[PDB]
Amino acid sequence: SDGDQCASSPCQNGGSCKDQLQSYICFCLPAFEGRNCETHKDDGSA
């Protein structure tokens, strides 16, 4: 481990938190956005 990234589950939008060395990876729906899933992108456009 390298730093407290996935300690208190920073992933939001009910996403899964996985430690990927140093940083982390949140598993959120394809309609969310943001490093910690703090945005809901539902426009599409292009």
| Burial (0-12, 13-18, 19+ Cβ within 10 Å), 11 | buried
Residue type, 14: G
- Torsional class of 44: left (φ above 0), alpha (ψ -120 to 50), beta (otherwise): left
Three-point CA angle 11, 38, 3, nearest 5°: 40
> Dihedral through CA 37, CA 21, CA 16, CA 8, nearest 10?
-80
Residue 1 belongs to domain with CATH number: 2.10.25.10
Structural domain total, the chain: 1
Distance CA 7, CA 41 (A): 26
Residue 11: give the domain boundaries. 1-46
> Please, are residues 11 and 34 in contact by the beta-carbon 8 Å criterion?
no
Residue 9: other Cβ atoms inside 10 A:
12
